[PDB]
Symmetry: C3
Subunit: 71 residues, 3 copies
């Protein structure tokens, strides 16, 4: 049914919008006056680690949408 096929298309768009928005709204951490200190480097690493998770969910969501013929 579309009952399912709209559940799928809705799921997908909501997931992709959520993902896209959270990814793009995150500020990239660039060093300030303290340079490449331990605080800075942690912030960079934590940024990359979080971004991985959200990117990975985003691609997975897209692929599922492609597999399920939702787009």
């Amino acid at each position: 049914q579309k009952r399912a096929q709209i559940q799928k298309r809705e799921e997908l768009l909501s997931a992709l919008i959520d993902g896209t928005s959270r990814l793009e709204n995150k500020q990239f951490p660039y060093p300030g006056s303290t340079g490449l200190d331990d605080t800075y480097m942690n912030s960079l690493i934590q940024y990359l680690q979080e971004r991985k998770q959200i990117e990975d969910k985003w691609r997975a969501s897209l692929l599922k949408g492609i597999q399920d013929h939702v787009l």
Copy 2:
């Protein structure tokens, strides 16, 4: 109209091709003989910061294409 629906499909493909090509053609900076010096680390950080921007535009373009039924 397709006047719009081709404007949309054309926009999209051009944007995605531009993005894809700029992302893939960028060389990943790996340390050389000077190791993890301040020059190297800046080059890595600037690479990541730029790549974020282009990746974020690319995903946004794709999502818009999905939302507008252009693909």
Copy 3:
């Protein structure tokens, strides 16, 4: 033909599944008790360098799929 159009849709899905799975299954390297030592920083850099390659192939595969009307 679909002979080609299924070759294309099959190629694509297999490529995207391969890519997605390899990206998401890779553990993000976060520093341990030794901190930001040269071993750690190499592991981070090698992670990013590999991830670039696989991400870039994944996007290229997707775009080709969009261009060839396979999805």
